[PDB]
Nucleic acid binder design. Sequence first.
RNA 1: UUGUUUUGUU
Lengths: 86, 85
Amino acid sequence: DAIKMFVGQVPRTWSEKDLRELFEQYGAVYEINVLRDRSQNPPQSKGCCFVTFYTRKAALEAQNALHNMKVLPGMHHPIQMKPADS
Amino acid sequence: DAIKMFVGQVPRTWSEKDLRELFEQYGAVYEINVLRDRSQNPPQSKGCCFVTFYTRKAALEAQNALHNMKVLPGMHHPIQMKPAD
RNA sequence: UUGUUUUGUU
């Protein structure tokens, strides 16, 4: 079943596409939303995103593999990934 | 004398001229700047603007009549209008 | 500047 995950510590230069290539190693991805500050031109990434997988299996596999495990280029802390508050 | 108002919650299809049509009901309008994302092409509207009235009586009447009162067509919120920073 | 977006103030 689909579950929406919060991901943080992503570099501001990464787009939905860059991130999709990241998470798809773990399972199909239904939707990626980079959180942006719409006051910028163009809107800046806030360094985090929302990602929904088609299955809870994929989302777990990813959380295991990434959360506190992997540090993205130029970042200073490892990915934070967990069920989004929503 | 000239008072500059920020106005938010405006449809991205509206241009300076549509906005001037709206504010000019309340008094003479000196200038309107639609805030645009010039990185876009065409540059894209950010859905807010600055509008400058020649007199504060017009700006306060527009503000009173619009801020939180009118919802422009297609919007999910009422116009936000206050004196610009 | 660990951030859970759509309120946007050139």
